[PDB]
């Protein structure tokens, strides 16, 4: 079990620009 995958292309680790992404509400405080 936990079968493996064969003949896998490398991920090649491309990059794309994040833009205005990755924003969270740090605290549970209403403002």
């Amino acid at each position: 079990k936990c079968l493996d995958f064969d003949d896998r292309t490398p991920p090649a680790n491309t990059q794309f620009l994040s833009s205005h992404r990755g924003v969270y509400y740090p605290d549970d405080i209403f403002r």
Partner: protein
Amino acid sequence: LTPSSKRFQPFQQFGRDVSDFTDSVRDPKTSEILDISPCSFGGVSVITP
């Protein structure tokens, strides 16, 4: 203690002022958002001839 007007986010419990004062609260036991304001405080001044 007064009822709060504006709609809080479900996770957001305490409302904050520009100067970081807390002007609203969420009840931990019951559930309701309450507006918070200071009690009155002035300076007495005696007018006298």
